[PDB]
Amino acid sequence: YTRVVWCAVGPEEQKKCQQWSQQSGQNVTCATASTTDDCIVLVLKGEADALNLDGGYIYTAGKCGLVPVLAENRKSSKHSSLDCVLRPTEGYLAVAVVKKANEGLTWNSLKDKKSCHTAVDRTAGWNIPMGLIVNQTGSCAFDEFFSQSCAPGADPKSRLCALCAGDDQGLDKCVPNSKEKYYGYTGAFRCLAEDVGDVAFVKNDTVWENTNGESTADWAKNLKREDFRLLCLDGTRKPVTEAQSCHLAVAPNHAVVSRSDRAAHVEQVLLHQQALFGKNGKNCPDKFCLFKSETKNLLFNDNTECLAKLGGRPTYEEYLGTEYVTAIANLKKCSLEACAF
Ligand SMILES: *[C@@H]1O[C@H](CO)[C@@H](O[C@@H]2O[C@H](CO)[C@@H](O[C@@H]3O[C@H](CO)[C@@H](O[C@@H]4O[C@H](CO)[C@@H](O[C@H]5O[C@H](CO)[C@@H](O[C@@H]6O[C@H](CO)[C@@H](O)[C@H](O)[C@@H]6O)[C@H](O)[C@@H]5O)[C@H](O)[C@@H]4O)[C@H](O)[C@@H]3O)[C@H](O)[C@H]2NC(C)=O)[C@H](O)[C@H]1NC(C)=O
Ligand SMILES: *[C@@H]1O[C@H](CO)[C@@H](O[C@@H]2O[C@H](CO)[C@@H](O[C@@H]3O[C@H](CO[C@@H]4O[C@H](CO)[C@@H](O)[C@H](O)[C@@H]4O)[C@@H](O[C@H]4O[C@H](CO)[C@@H](O)[C@H](O)[C@@H]4O)[C@H](O)[C@@H]3O)[C@H](O)[C@H]2NC(C)=O)[C@H](O)[C@H]1NC(C)=O
Ligand SMILES: *[C@@H]1O[C@H](CO)[C@@H](O[C@@H]2O[C@H](CO)[C@@H](O)[C@H](O)[C@H]2NC(C)=O)[C@H](O)[C@H]1NC(C)=O
Ligand SMILES: OC[C@H]1O[C@@H](OC[C@H]2O[C@H](O)[C@H](O)[C@@H](O)[C@@H]2O)[C@H](O)[C@@H](O)[C@H]1O
Ligand SMILES: [Fe+3]
Ligand SMILES: [Zn+2]
Ligand SMILES: [Zn+2]
């Protein structure tokens, strides 16, 4: 009744959800699916209530009638006066990142290089960079642009999965969940860091969070920001300090979605859960913190300060913005209006 079923993607998010479920005294319980699209179907069926989604998936869910409920809000130096929950969201910067040592690699020499993407259908990892590449090349053959990639969610037999590694045992190669070694923001940046790919399509924050000792994970321990460069659309290369002038787009924040008929109940529950387990929550450091998982961004991004109310009670189209929505529709015509399930 006043209980919410969260949808977890893969086994590691399932483990975090179970902990939260326990600590919440079953105010939250957990359903699990192997992929975000499967979680979306659980929500539509009414077998789960909610999950936090990247903007590309919000577009999928939105066509099927799911609505945005609360948004991830990270820290800002502006609007600092306003409480986090009431503060407007800023959006994150989609960037293309290379190694400084890979000299003369620019935006205009990316063809036939090796790429690292968060997952198919995601904003920074896929929709933004592939949308630009389609427009620029006047071709829908974006599966032939890079020599080899890791793009979780593509055909495992294809060149788009050639660089993906699967799990400890090499199983689940290219699955779009955190079992895949090079999945997600952190995974795609790891793919670059280890020189599997020439370029990673991630967000600005990912680079900062996994360099200069911010991570402590074995692969990230010795990474230095100066060893990296951003690719700008004008063919230039900049330091990672210059993302405000060298990004591919600004992305809408990840946001919790639910069925419209459940939105109000999901919202009320989540606001109480974050008071307990959020950033300064009564129980966070002590028992459980919702927004931590050791750099793994499980359920929510680890840099989330709070979940924020939306305001102007936006539809999914208003939330994503007309800019981004037309980007996706145009790219989507390479792969006609309805729910995809
Ligand atoms: C790319 O991604 C990066 C990773 O997310 C991100 O870097 C991150 O930036 C944030 C800031 O947005 C940093 O948070 C900050 O961390 C410091 C610890 O070093 C904290 O310590 C202080 O916190 C204070 C309270 O909020 C803060 O006071 C604030 O209020 C004063 C009012 O007097 C004001 O001062 C002014 O600042 C203006 C804007 O910068 C400046 O122009 C003006 O001259 C004036 O001095 C500010 O509004 C100020 O915020 C203190 O200043 C301290 O910061 C604090 O929690 C703070 O929020 C993250 O540490 C940092 N992450 C990492 C890992 O480095 C980049 O910003 C992203 N880049 C782009 C382009 O988006
Ligand atoms: C890949 O390429 C495709 C194809 O080019 C791109 O899709 C186009 O994206 C454009 C930008 O989103 C979009 O441009 C249109 O621009 C006009 C004018 O821009 C306006 O700016 C105003 C700010 O002062 C703002 O108030 C307006 O809302 C608008 O943003 C817009 O107006 C049109 O519609 C009006 C209908 O009432 C009409 O009167 C007017 O004459 C215009 O036709 C419009 O809303 C839009 O922004 C263009 O529509 C897109 N083209 C297609 C085919 O859909 C992709 O974005 C590219 N992909 C990537 C990743 O970049
Ligand atoms: C589980 O949910 C119930 C219902 O919201 C919570 O009980 C409320 O707790 C608040 C403040 O913590 C009290 O002031 C109210 O009187 C309670 N409301 C009702 C209707 O019982 C409970 O706190 C939740 N538990 C956890 C651990 O999240
Ligand atoms: O792209 C402009 C767009 O803005 C819409 O709402 C704001 C929206 O804009 C970005 O996507 C931002 O990063 C998001 O966090 C934010 O939700 C607007 O309603 C829409 O019509 C359009 O103009
Ligand atoms: Fe994203
Ligand atoms: Zn910009
Ligand atoms: Zn509206």
Coordinates of C-alpha atoms in Angstrom, one line a residue, residues 10 20 43 58 75 84 92-93 109 118 128 146 157 182 188 196 209 224 252 266 268 275 281 293 300 304:
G10 CA 21.4 -6.8 -12.4
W20 CA 17.9 -0.6 1.6
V43 CA 6.9 -1.0 -14.0
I58 CA 13.3 8.4 -19.9
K75 CA 26.1 20.0 -5.6
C84 CA 18.6 20.8 -2.4
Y92 CA 25.5 17.3 -16.8
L93 CA 28.0 17.8 -19.5
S109 CA 39.9 11.8 -36.9
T118 CA 28.2 3.7 -21.3
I128 CA 24.5 12.5 -28.1
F146 CA 34.3 2.8 -35.2
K157 CA 28.6 -10.9 -32.1
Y182 CA 33.0 -1.7 -19.1
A188 CA 33.4 3.3 -20.2
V196 CA 41.1 -0.9 -24.6
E209 CA 35.7 11.3 -9.8
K224 CA 46.1 11.7 -13.2
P252 CA 19.1 16.3 -18.4
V266 CA 6.3 7.0 -5.1
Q268 CA 6.0 10.8 -0.9
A275 CA 15.4 12.2 5.0
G281 CA 20.1 11.6 6.6
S293 CA 28.2 2.4 -3.5
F300 CA 21.6 6.4 -8.1
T304 CA 23.8 12.7 -5.9

